[PDB]
């Protein structure tokens, strides 16, 4: 029939500010109509790599919930937002499962997220004792202990603050320019699936 109540993709993609990768925002999307062809046919995205599903049948299939994780990383770190990858972002900031069904969408945001003095409003986790589990968020600001000596809460020698700021200048290279990444996670659970695609008339 006639379809209304589209899913709020404007508040995820067109958000005025994005979260840092250590504190990535997760929005649960339920009970609406998700039109994915609007996103796929956009010319504004540089990466639209979908894992476990193809973008053409997204607008047909139906899912129980959609998890929209949003953050900002560097240009050279977009490749680490993938199943099975290794790096600072994958190990310590945002980990994707190997059995991941969803899409990784990234686009350049040098226009918004870079200022001439340097935009340091985006921090990443540089050190953690162990790698993250998939879809884990670590917002702890406890001093990393790299050595045998106790840190005692002060950043001295062999003891580092785990959160480090990104330097974003507009004159940086494309591998250092800020990229806004939205990861959509599609799961089907035994509850009635309510995030469905648009139905043609």
């Amino acid at each position: 029939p006639n379809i209304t109540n589209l899913c709020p993709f404007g508040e995820v993609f067109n958000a005025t500010r994005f979260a840092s990768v250590y504190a990535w925002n997760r929005k649960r999307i339920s009970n609406c109509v998700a039109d994915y062809s609007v996103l796929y046919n956009s010319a504004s995205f540089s990466t639209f790599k979908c894992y476990g599903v193809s973008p053409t049948k997204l607008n047909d299939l139906c899912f129980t919930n959609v998890y929209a994780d949003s953050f900002v990383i560097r240009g050279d770190e977009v490749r680490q937002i993938a199943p099975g990858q290794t790096g600072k972002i994958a190990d310590y900031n945002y980990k994707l499962p190997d059995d991941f069904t969803g899409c990784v969408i990234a686009w350049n945001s040098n226009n918004l997220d870079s200022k001439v003095g340097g935009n340091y409003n985006y921090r990443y986790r540089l050190f953690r004792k162990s790698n993250l589990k998939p879809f884990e968020r670590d917002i702890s600001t406890e001093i990393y202990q790299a050595g045998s000596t106790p840190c005692n809460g002060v950043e001295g020698f062999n003891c580092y603050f785990p959160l480090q700021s990104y330097g974003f200048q507009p004159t940086n290279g494309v591998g250092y320019q800020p990229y806004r990444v939205v990861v959509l996670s599609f799961e089907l659970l035994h509850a009635p699936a309510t995030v469905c695609g648009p139905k043609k008339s």
Binding site: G118, F127, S148, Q164, G167, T171, N172, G173, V174, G175
Partner: protein, 596 residues
């Protein structure tokens, strides 16, 4: 846990906090260079002081990790680079004195203005006031006046400063477990810990002498030919048996002989390969020059320039209102920002310089994947050599015909190849004995082989023995004739040009064998060859992660610098010079026979 993991985490923290700070310092230096204004000078000085203080604090933190408990070669290389004291091992009073001496030598060299006694109402600076006189005059006493007056003023100012400089630098170097400051400079080529590919600081002097002994017959024949032509130009001053007078070499110091090409041309009647008029007729902008250089680098298979390069580089002189340094410089600012600052004119020299500086940019782009403290050349010779090979390839008549800048009906006979090779010898071969003699003299000064009261008696003796150049009038110890040059007065290593010159032709033979060129080496062009670019990029991507001996194995298949590619490059010219020197006498006498 372990020391190696601790050093790895410390190096991650260092690279992270030293990349943005190096980018700020480099951006401030760029803003000074494109805009000479006093607030930009202050911003540059503030960024440089922050960068140096951060390097002092990180070296102080870095020393607490002992070197012998780390087995990974890259981590040990970064820790070796970071743990150097520099001037920090020296006392604070002596460090301040050394910094003051370096700054005042920089100001004396930069603001040194010399003119004729009894006519002091206006005076000429070195660039371009004295450069044009040295490069273009044909008058014996005018060049003698300019040469002696500039070495009188500059040497008599700089001699006590250099006497303090040698003592302070030797004190700093022996405080850093080096034999002298010469050993500190030779430590750039030191490779330790790699099986077979180890290179020693003491092997550098032996290799330089061993290569120069093979340089010497070609330079002797070139010197005899230049002596005969300068005897034709100046009838009575030059002796058939003696050395060349010092002020007649076409440059201020004798660094290059390329300004004697007009006087010493073999076949003036035959045409030149000058392509300047052809670009003027087709209205080639500097943007077109750099786009043709980019076409050359994509033809060999190297990556093309970034968008930020075309947006952020200054490839044209800005104007009267905005001041900028005219010297062409390629800038690796950090964080993937690569720029060229060149005041590009429509000339062959600026076009070849564009190829040279974009070769510098390609070298900088290739090791961007490396860690921050390993983002350099494998030695100081490779970084300049990879630009000079592009200058070699772009200057060939095949490249000019291929891009349409030269007429397709231009006749390439043997005479044009001989005179082109002679121009390349005046640029390239002529700088080799001057470079070797200057570095050997500085090494003997730092080593203490030459006492301070005997610096100049030995120096002219070295110049007569090696370069075959005699002083016009004798100089006492009140003169400081070496420090009138830019590199020695401003604390720069000088063996990089010798090593660059040999690595240039070694890389050229390797890439021309890769490109399957079937003729003479100087007729070889490395465009259109993907495999030559791949062989180049294998070494280019390494940066300072691997030893320079292993990088040279990666390119040419040899573990050491070699002199045979240079001699193979100039072999037509060598046979022609041997034919032309039948009547004349090869070699010189170190006595005062022409004039003293």
């Amino acid at each position: 846990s372990t020391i190696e993991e601790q050093a790895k985490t410390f190096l991650d923290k260092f690279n992270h906090e030293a990349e943005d700070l190096f980018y700020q310092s480099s951006l401030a230096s760029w803003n000074y260079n494109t805009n000479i204004t006093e607030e930009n000078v202050q911003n540059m000085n503030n960024a440089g002081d922050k960068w140096s203080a951060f390097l002092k604090e990180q070296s102080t933190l870095a020393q607490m990790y002992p070197l012998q408990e780390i087995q990974n070669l890259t981590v040990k290389l970064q820790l070796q680079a970071l743990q150097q004291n520099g001037s920090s091992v020296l006392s604070e009073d002596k460090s301040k004195r050394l910094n003051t001496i370096l700054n005042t030598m920089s100001t004396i060299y930069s603001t040194g203005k010399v003119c004729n006694p009894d006519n002091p109402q206006e005076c000429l600076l070195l660039e371009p006031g004295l450069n044009e006189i040295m490069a273009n005059s044909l008058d014996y006493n005018e060049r003698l006046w300019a040469w002696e007056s500039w070495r009188s003023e500059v040497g008599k100012q700089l001699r006590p400063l250099y006497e303090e400089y040698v003592v302070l630098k030797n004190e700093m170097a022996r405080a850093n477990h080096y034999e002298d400051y010469g050993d500190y400079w030779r430590g750039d080529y030191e490779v330790n810990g790699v099986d077979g590919y180890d290179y020693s600081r003491g092997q550098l002097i032996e290799d330089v002498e061993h290569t120069f002994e093979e340089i010497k017959p070609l330079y002797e024949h070139l010197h005899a030919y230049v002596r005969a032509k300068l005897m034709n130009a100046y009838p009575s001053y030059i002796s058939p048996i003696g050395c060349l007078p010092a002020h007649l070499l076409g440059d201020m110091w004798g660094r290059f002989w390329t300004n004697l090409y007009s006087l010493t041309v073999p076949f003036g009647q035959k045409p030149n390969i000058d392509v300047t008029d052809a670009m003027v007729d087709q209205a080639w902008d500097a943007q077109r020059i750099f786009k043709e250089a980019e076409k050359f680098f994509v033809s060999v298979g190297l990556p093309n320039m970034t968008q930020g390069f075309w947006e952020n580089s200054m490839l044209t002189d800005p104007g009267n209102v905005q001041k900028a340094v005219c010297h062409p410089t390629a800038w690796d600012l950090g964080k993937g920002d690569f720029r060229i600052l060149m005041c590009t004119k429509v000339t062959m020299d600026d076009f070849l310089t564009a190829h040279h500086e974009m070769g510098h940019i390609q070298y900088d782009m290739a090791y961007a994947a490396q860690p921050f403290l390993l983002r350099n050349g494998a030695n100081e010779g490779f970084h300049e050599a990879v630009g000079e090979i592009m200058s070699l390839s772009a200057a060939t008549p095949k490249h000019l015909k291929s891009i349409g800048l030269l007429s397709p009906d231009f006749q390439e006979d043997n005479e044009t190849e001989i005179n082109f090779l002679l121009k390349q010898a005046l640029t390239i071969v002529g700088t080799l004995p001057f470079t070797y003699m200057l570095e050997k003299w500085r090494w003997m000064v730092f080593k203490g082989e030459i006492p301070k009261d005997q610096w100049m008696k030995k120096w002219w003796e070295m110049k007569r023995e090696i370069v075959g150049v005699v002083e016009p009038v004798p100089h006492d110890e009140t003169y400081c004739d070496p420090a009138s040059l830019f590199h020695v007065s401003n604390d720069y290593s000088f063996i990089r040009y010798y090593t660059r010159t040999l690595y240039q032709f070694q890389f050229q033979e390797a890439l021309c064998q890769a490109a399957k060129h079937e003729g003479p080496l100087h007729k070889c062009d490395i465009s259109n060859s993907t495999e030559a670019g791949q062989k180049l990029f294998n070494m280019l991507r390494l940066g300072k992660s691997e030893p320079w001996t292993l990088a040279l194995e990666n390119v040419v298949g040899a573990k050491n610098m070699n002199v045979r590619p240079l001699l193979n490059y100039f072999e037509p010219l060598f046979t022609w010079l041997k034919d032309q020197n039948k009547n004349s006498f090869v070699g010189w006498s170190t006595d005062w026979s022409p004039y003293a």
